[PDB]
Amino acid sequence: LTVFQCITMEGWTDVLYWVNDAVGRDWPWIYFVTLIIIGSFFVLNLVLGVLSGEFSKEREKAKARGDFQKLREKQQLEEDLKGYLDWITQAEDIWNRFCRRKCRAAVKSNVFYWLVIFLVFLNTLTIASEHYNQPNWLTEVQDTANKALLALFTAEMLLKMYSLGLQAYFVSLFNRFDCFVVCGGILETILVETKIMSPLGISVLRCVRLLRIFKITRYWNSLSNLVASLLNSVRSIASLLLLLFLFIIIFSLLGMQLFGGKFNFDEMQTRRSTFDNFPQSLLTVFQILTGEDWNSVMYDGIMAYGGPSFPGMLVCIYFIILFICGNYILLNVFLAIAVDNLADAESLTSAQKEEEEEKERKKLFRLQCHRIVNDTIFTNLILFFILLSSISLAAEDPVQHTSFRNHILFYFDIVFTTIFTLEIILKMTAYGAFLHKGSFCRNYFNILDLLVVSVSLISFGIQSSAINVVKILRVLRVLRPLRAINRAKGLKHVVQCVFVAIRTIGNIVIVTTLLQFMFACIGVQLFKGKLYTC
Amino acid sequence: TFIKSFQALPYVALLIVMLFFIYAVIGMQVFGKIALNDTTEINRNNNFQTFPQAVLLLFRCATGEAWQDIMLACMPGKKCAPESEPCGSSFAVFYFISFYMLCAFLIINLFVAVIMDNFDYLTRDWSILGPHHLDEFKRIWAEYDPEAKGRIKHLDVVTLLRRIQPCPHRVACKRLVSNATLFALVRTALRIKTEGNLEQANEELRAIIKKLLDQVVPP
Amino acid sequence: WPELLYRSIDSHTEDKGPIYNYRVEISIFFIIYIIIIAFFMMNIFVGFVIVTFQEQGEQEYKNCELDKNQRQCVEYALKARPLRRYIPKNQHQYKVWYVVNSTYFEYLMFVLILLNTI
Amino acid sequence: SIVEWKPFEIIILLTIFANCVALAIYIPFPEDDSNATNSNLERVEYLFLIIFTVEAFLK
Amino acid sequence: DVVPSMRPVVLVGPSLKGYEVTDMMQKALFDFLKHRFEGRISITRVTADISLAKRLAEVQSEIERIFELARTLVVLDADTINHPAQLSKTSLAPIIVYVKISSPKVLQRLIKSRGKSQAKHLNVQMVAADKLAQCPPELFDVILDENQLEDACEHLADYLEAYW
Ligand SMILES: CCCCCCCCCCCCCCCC
Ligand SMILES: CCCCCCCCCCCCCCCC
Ligand SMILES: CCCCCCCCCCCCCCCC
Ligand SMILES: [Ca+2]
Ligand SMILES: [Ca+2]
């Protein structure tokens, strides 16, 4: 039971510290660290591998099921409706209605698009400006800004409504969503004026304003393809989520019949995560699924069913099965949804975008007797010096101010500063020195060698000052190990591939950050200081 | 196979070690002198005093183990340890949040790199023949033949361990007639093409695909 | 998480202390946030990294050539190498070799180790 | 048998849903306590028993 | 045979000209033709038949008056040509344009918006689109694939630079 408690990583460190307090701190960390690494990380890696790889099988079968091919059919379909309805839009106008051409012209113009983006920025700044005890004037500023932005947004919304065909306008998903958010804003105005608004109303309506903040991220396609695939798969998404919801209901209704109201102990009732009533049994089951304080709930159940004994304490079966099935059933549903759909979504960025690109294409100092020698053995030698320099500061004593070892490490620092400035002197001989077409400024990694050396040197320059300036210099001097990157031939490949991965992740990470900001704004609206407790 | 993949991607592991090292050192100097005390996260068992302890604390934070309380422990205003002749910075929030994101990202990166490296086997229907079939064929032949003692020497059908997965319609006899045995099985177990010219067609393939002795391949 | 959830459920009014289970509907906010952000979006991170690495690995897709199974097989075309068996020559050696190498001996030794762990 | 041709399985699944609802309301009081609702859910359970056993007999 | 000093321009639309939608596919289109070919292009409006040409009474002078405008050194618009066959009966060295809807599923959506009177008359309209999906490239010279006007309009001008 305890080893299994460590594999799930929850309550891990508690048993490690309890053991350390019994058999000393020296060796015991080995056991639990190896337990975590081996058990948790290898099993997690293997389950991810055998799901993702398996998910590729069902993806391959799906491609025969026309799942992706049919998706492209609904994309070009709706796409061409606007383009052809544009003709009628441009043909219905060949009472005088010559201003229609001008109003439509601004709609596609960059001036109006960037103006509306800026208005959205003001909208998000106003709501994001929330604050616990707002200055009294800021409340009026926020309210009047909300009124103003509402008036404008509805004005240009109607402008697009009449400038473009109403049917064509409603065809687009984004325009329908914008109509939804503006209607929510109208509701905001009416409810606030009539004073019949309710906390659910303020919550969901601040939410609709924040939705209107989705007007940002419109040009980009990577999120758009994900959204399109998600909308296509909704009828498939709802099945998995319905199944998981049914499973949580079952494992909550079972906990009610097992631990229903048996969590009454003479100890102080901090058992908030209890099984008493169904609305809270769900929260406890959800907590177990994510596995935050799984230990606490399992221990409470064990104690409820007697103490540690054979007839009791068998309850561990329920918690173990719940946790295993959960973090397996959750893993299947969520990886399936985030791989099959995303893999399909990513293929739109490669299927329709790629061919369309083709369609457009189809439509169309001293320099003499220098010594660069010895730069071969010095490769490994500099590697070794970097390694030992890194090890140097690690062994430093942080807690002893008048340290018996800091002066020794100061000697090592002096020696290694000399050694690592030798190659700084050398680099002048090689092409560079910010001259000779700037061969030195074409490899910033080479420059980064000086920066760390400079800070190391700069530490001594102000060291004699005995002043607080040098305090940060020591902290920053830790950049030494990275020097190996520029001196390593594979580590460079690894770090560059990692940066490429980051650049790829950019879209998803920014979408997650924006949606998290949405939820932060809603949370500010709900709990703006209602958490204090004496 | 998973262990072998880990061998082939050591620099990602070295990168993770570099992250741990840099962050352990940074935590060593800023949050070094925090006063140890029970009833708080920074205690005798977690602290940035000795490098092993700093690495252990950062590992604890990596496993998502109440790292938020550690963060709140290192936020400023904390009494400094007696060794000082107060301590605690406001840099903690950025330190721990950045560490969590970066360590999670590199752990994900290592996991998916190994998944990429083992993708071939992790995505294998086990229906088409695989190297396991070749290994069991090698073992049965070794039982039939000790070290490097097979050139033709064949007059029996004891090599019937081949099950339904590659004498049905005597195709086995025809395949036997048509390292040489392994090559013939490979080219014909898949049944790539049947036009009476695969040997010629393959004879024009091994030349471009290859290097080593090809005076036995044609047979 | 649960500490925050059960401190927020007890949120009565601005600048006032908590009340036991005042509004337990608030859990909808935390439930939705949990599922969407954590589960959905971090799993999207993992799936997106998987897809990107799969795409990068298939850079040398070489669709003109045939399956990769033949690739592995022909790269193994240097197989059929000697394998160490060393059938004992001495008959006294041969008896112990046969009894040791029989599957019965292996099964028995597995039972021994299993009982040892028990 | 021909009754199964008549789609009563819809009403049977609505009955299963009704029973699923009739279990969230059942509050499990600590030690034998029971309010009024818990004293009518036994009767509702008897009804569900009868309908399910009739369906089992038919099928 | 002999060019009428010009290559007359016609457009059959994606389906019958008898309804509003087909004309509107070209009503604005013709506007840009003269607005970017000042003096280089001329347009004509007729309502009679031109298929019956021997290279009805109104047809006799119809071919001449077109040739009268062709001798000025031209775009024709009618309701007779629903297929290049309707114009293949005469050899006037013409240029003919075709509006294409690659997905007939779009036809209903376009029809479903203008009016419910002809909404049930889609079968009348769509069959021509089918009829406009058979002629090989030879009778399918001018191509209108892209959707909006600006991208499509640029592909009209390029074919007009064959001679001028
Ligand atoms: C899933 C692991 C546990 C399942 C079996 C229950 C274990 C019960 C045996 C341990 C208790 C023995 C008596 C202890 C007396 C203090
Ligand atoms: C299915 C995932 C878990 C969902 C947990 C939240 C369920 C709803 C709880 C609140 C129900 C109403 C409470 C009583 C009336 C205010
Ligand atoms: C599917 C809709 C109906 C779901 C509810 C069916 C059972 C309701 C009966 C029990 C309700 C409590 C009444 C107890 C007397 C105060
Ligand atoms: Ca925890
Ligand atoms: Ca966790």
CB contact under 8 A, B192 and C70: yes
Q: Which of A40, A44, A22, A43 is nearest to A32 (CA)?
A: A40
Q: Which of E145, E132, E32, E98 is nearest to A80 (CA)?
A: E145
CA dist., res. A410 & res. A463, Å (int):
12
Among A81, A87, A363, select the one facing E28 at the smallest CB separation.
Answer: A87
Burial class (CB in 10 A: 0-12, 13-18, 19+), A111: exposed
CA dist., res. E153 & res. A109, Å (int):
19
- Tokens 């950062």 correspond to B58
CA dist., res. A287 & res. A272, Å (int):
11
CA distances from A44 to A7, B98, B121, C56, C63 (A): 10, 23, 18, 23, 33
CA dihedral B29, B31, B35, B41 (to 10 degrees): -140
CA dist., res. E99 & res. A231, Å (int):
32
Going by alpha carbons, the residue nearest to atom 12 of ligand 2 is C25
- B141-144, Cβ contacts within 8 angstroms, sequence gap of 24 or more: B141/B181, B141/C80, B142/C83, B142/C85, B143/C85
> Residue B167 C-alpha to ligand 5 middle, in angstroms?
57
The rounded Cα A343 to chain-centroid distance in angstroms is: 19
- Tokens 């607005």 correspond to E35
Strand residues in E51-94 grouped as ranges (E): none
A88, A166, A172: best to mutate for the E interface, most E CBs within 10 A: A88
CB contact under 8 A, D28 and A253: no
CA dist., res. B42 & res. B74, Å (int):
8
CA dist., res. A298 & res. A255, Å (int):
12
Residue A511 amino acid letter? V
Residue A40 amino acid letter? S
Write out the DSSP string of A46-59: HHHHHHHHHHHHHH
Within 6 A (CB) of ligand 1 lie A 1, 308-310, 313-314, 316, 320
CA dist., res. E3 & res. E73, Å (int):
12
Is the CB of residue A45 less than 8 Å away from at least one CB of chain B?
yes
Contacts of D30 in chain A (CB under 8 A): 261-262, 264
CB contact under 8 A, E148 and A91: no
CA dist., res. A18 & res. B45, Å (int):
10
For chain A, the C-alpha Rg in angstroms (whole number) is: 32
CA dist., res. E115 & res. A377, Å (int):
84
A54, A399, A402: best to mutate for the B interface, most B CBs within 10 A: A399
A304: its two tokens = 């409820």
CA dihedral B168, B174, B176, B177 (to 10 degrees): 160
Residue A117 amino acid letter? I
CA dist., res. A25 & res. A30, Å (int):
10
Please report which helix (H) or strand (E) contains residue E9, including its range. strand E9-11
* Residue pair B74/B47 in contact by the 8 Å Cβ criterion: no
Residues 6+ apart with CB under 8 A from A153: A116, A119, A123, A182, A185, A212
Burial class (CB in 10 A: 0-12, 13-18, 19+), B204: exposed
* Residue pair A316/A1 in contact by the 8 Å Cβ criterion: yes
CA dihedral E22, E27, E32, E34 (to 10 degrees): 120
Angle at A471 between CA A467 and CA A475, to 5 degrees: 160
For chain D, the C-alpha Rg in angstroms (whole number) is: 15
Technique used by the depositors = cryo-EM
CA distances from A94 to A100, E12, E153 (A): 11, 19, 15
CA dist., res. B73 & res. B27, Å (int):
13
User: Can you give the three-state secondary structure of chain C, one letter per residue?
Assistant: CHHHHHHHCCCCCCCCCCCCCCCHHHHHHHHHHHHHHHHHHHHHHHHHHHHHHHHHHHHHCCCCCCCHHHHHHHHHHHCCCCCCCCCCCCHHHHHHHHHHHCHHHHHHHHHHHHHHHC
CA dist., res. C31 & res. A287, Å (int):
10
CA dist., res. B44 & res. B49, Å (int):
10
CA dist., res. C39 & res. A331, Å (int):
9
* 111-170 in chain B: CB under 8 A from chain A: 111, 114-115, 118-119, 122-123, 125
